[PDB]
Amino acid sequence: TRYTAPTQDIQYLLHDVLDVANDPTPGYAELEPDFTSAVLEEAGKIAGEVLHPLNAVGDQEGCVLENGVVRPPKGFKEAFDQVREGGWTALDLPEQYGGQNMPYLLGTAVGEMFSGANQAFTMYQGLTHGAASAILVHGTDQQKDTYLPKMFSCDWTGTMNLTEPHCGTDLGLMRSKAVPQDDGSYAISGQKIFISAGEHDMAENIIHLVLAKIPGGPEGIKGVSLFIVPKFLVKEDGSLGERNGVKCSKIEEKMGIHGNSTCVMDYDGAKGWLLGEEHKGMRAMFTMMNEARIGVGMQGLAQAEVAYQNALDYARDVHPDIRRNLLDQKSFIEGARAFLLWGAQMIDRAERGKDEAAHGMVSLLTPVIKGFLTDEGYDMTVQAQQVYGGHGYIEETGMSQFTRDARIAMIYEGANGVQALDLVGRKLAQDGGKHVMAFFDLVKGFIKEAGTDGAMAEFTEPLKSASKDLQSAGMFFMQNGMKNPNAALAGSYDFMHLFGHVCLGLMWGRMAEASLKALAEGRGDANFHETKLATARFYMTRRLPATKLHLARIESGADPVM
Template sequence: MPEYKAPLRDMRFVMDEVFDFAAGYQALGLQDVEPDLVNAILEEGAKFAGEVLAPLNRIGDEEGCHIENGVVTTPKGFKEAYQQYVENGWGSITGPTEYGGQGLPASLGLVISEMVASANYAWSMYPGLSHGCAAAIRAHGTQAQKDLYLSKLTPGDWTGTMCLTEPHCGTDLGLIKTRAVPEADGTYRITGTKIFISCGEHDMAENIVHLVLAKLPDAPAGTKGISLFIVPKFLPDANGEVGERNSLACGSIEHKMGIKGSATCVMNFEGATGFLIGEINKGLNCMFTMMNHARLGTGMQGLCHGEASYQSAVAYARDRLQMRALSGPAFPDKPADPIIVHPDVRRMLLTMKAFNEGNRALSYYTAQLLDKAHYSSDEAERADAENQLAFLTPICKAFMTETGLEVTSHGVQVFGGHGFIREWGQEQQMRDCRIALLYEGTNGIQALDLLGRKVLGSQGKMLMAFTRQVHQFCKANEAHPTLGGYVKKLAQLNGQWGELTTKIGMKAMQNRDEVGAASVDYLMFSGYVTLAFFWLKMALVAQQQLDAGTSEADFYQTKLATQEFYFKRLLPRAQAHVEALEAGADCLMQLTAEQF
């Protein structure tokens, strides 16, 4: 079974040639992020991911996590890998320098996290959740809270979680029952049960910092009455080191379809000491500032499993001998031809490749927006980046995970019956990927966020900011000698995007159900058009390199062939989504609940 190797050439193509990360860093005043540094980080990151984390991926799935008396044991090797990760400074690359971080930009962090998570997604969740927790404290904590917790979370000595979901509510957090009772000393007693807490308990770090949503006794009903609390597993002592055990415990861990190396915990808080973070009753806002980043990370999961699945599939397809090419034997001296000669195997591999590489371009573009939103000295540029992020995040989360699941299913299919057997590793990618369509807001919720909150909620402005960019790109390239036809196709779809939105908006004024009836198909349409845009950007670069007589003709021809495949064989699906959503709400709403 081949193990994951970071596709550095493909990554560098997007970073250097399509989006010119280096120029971006210069423009944002990040002169310290020099090419040599970036090189070194990518090379070392690839090594760590491929050599340390990838070999633990199957072990993590086979062993899973175990709980005994509230103590959770992670799979063999996970703890040691985490120590190495912390010691080598991987956890802190984007962390604040004042707390021991390296202060590198989010775009670089995302590329590294792609490697880490592709090698071993379940493992990557432990540091991944910590980053989210640290970011929340950084954004909303008091100076004292920041000093205390970020100095531990940034290097990775402690890990963190986010405790939102309860047995009776996931999407609908207004229903939470966990209570926070104020004490005279300014702390709170937290009591309640949280479920689906990723990395809620484990043996990898000396302390775990839980961020817990809870309600004060006199809080208003619904989401306006939710506050956020820091609830550490061990209460820090006077020196800020691990002190007394807090009144909280992991009650059980879930048995899941996948990501088995990641402990999914039921956390019981029994009068645990908590510290308010941010304002009372503004807890959901605090959480939501983290959401975009977490959702982008979940979108990456689709790419990560997709890439790992593709690498195995293409190796298998070159190696496995079975049947002859339809056009006659390709290797008459062998007992059969490698299955990569068969058109349908190629269709599956190209589908995988086209989604993976398109999704990579989309996510790296989005990561550059994170840099701009954070570092730009130009307020308008920052605001534009924030708006684009708000618009693209639900697309990244849902489209990248839907297509990621499709990719991993093709990866199973390329292996034939062996794809179903655990030792080959392909079925694990599909099982692990399946969760990404569910958590961090189901894809249905993402679709409502995109169409309802972002697009219609901004009276179309967020959409237009993006389609304008696509329009300008199309205008500039419509006469391209070889790609012009594809540019016209993109321009047509881009125009349709706007018209479609107007139509839905009109209908939604009569009936709000029209938004929910259109939303998922609208999101998928948006994803297909967005990827078409990024595929054309990549194709233009590839064509330029070929025109200039590159020495890497094979590499760039493959980009052009994959872009052609995307336009001819995948993009037609966009129209099916249009037709489906134009059917409107009536055909969904006419049945009573009992008639189903």
């Protein structure tokens, strides 16, 4: 019902905590407070005044499919023009193809605001950004000159076409095919399901990235390639030619995000072009996973944020059960926003700084960003709906939509359980655990440096205790990883949440230390900083102790088989 962009909290994170204007990463020196302030207030105006009033409209209307045309909710198109016309869909993309090359950290902060105001709307440009990013990374110079300029501005949109009805979690079973043609292109045939924004009338062209097998390649995943398959073939001048052999043949009726079409896509000898290396389609997907995971983590946080604002309004129209509920929401949201943006900052250092240590740490942490933020974020939307009592169960109240939309973020882009197995079964073993050790040194380093201020001990000591639990958990996996992997993998989900709590506890440590220092120097509003110290204390004593529960569930071994 209302969305007020948390620009004050974001501005505090960027400058008091992440210290962006003095970060030596390329592009960060431009992020002066007046600049970031201006950008955030403009994006938050579009969020609160344009996107959010359409949120309930998209839930009420959904999408309609009429002879291969999909009409999104009334108003979505006009808001899509406004967002595009403002340059918002390529804040963080290279200037060569029309982007503004701002740091990904800032694209992510703006994206939280858009996604919270209206998740289903924001996925149209969110999915395009992901598809465009894959073409930037893997495209030939010709492919980037053909597709990126229109995709950066969302004149053209795009999306991924990965899985098939018979596949399941194993895309190495896919039956879609790509037959080489004498003109360099391929002809793609097959059927893809669960395609977000697979079809809609808000853009002149839709650029699909499709996984398919070139006949003759290795069996399973080792034979899958990636293809650019435009809805309308592009002519030499860049104008649109013939309708390509790709159509939405059905839209799904889903639990939520009704404003975002989900289709079955049919490919009937569609013209496409190899993206990346032949038979290395999944390699190409691997390189995109860090940002895709942060993007979905952001969605879950954003749902918690909007639901919490509206629960806090209802409460104000204090009760000790209500106060405890709202403080659980608020301490999670602000800790998770710090975790998200710190993650985004590290992507910038890995990508723009060519820093391999930042790249290793962020790749360890993104499954945690995705799984933890979407699970906790969903739980908070449920708790926010609970604040409304019986009114919370009525759809016109708006709260049910927040949970239902949040629900998909736990599922798509790698189901939370898959993120957990990847964390334990792939990420902990990278480079002899170097980046696991680095995260521990990070936590130990912060505890020892910040501990020189006695006022910080109230925060360093709960974090130290929580960090020993993560340390005790990483051990269980060092042993039983190979002597009883079933026991190791059974604890994966708990390990992901144990790690998640330590990450939020570290961020609360950092925010405590920054707000102490702003109080000691008289900077900023003194009530804001006192409120951060109280909210930090709440997280350390009320939420962080969950690490003991996750540890107990881990150190219990393999489950009974039955």
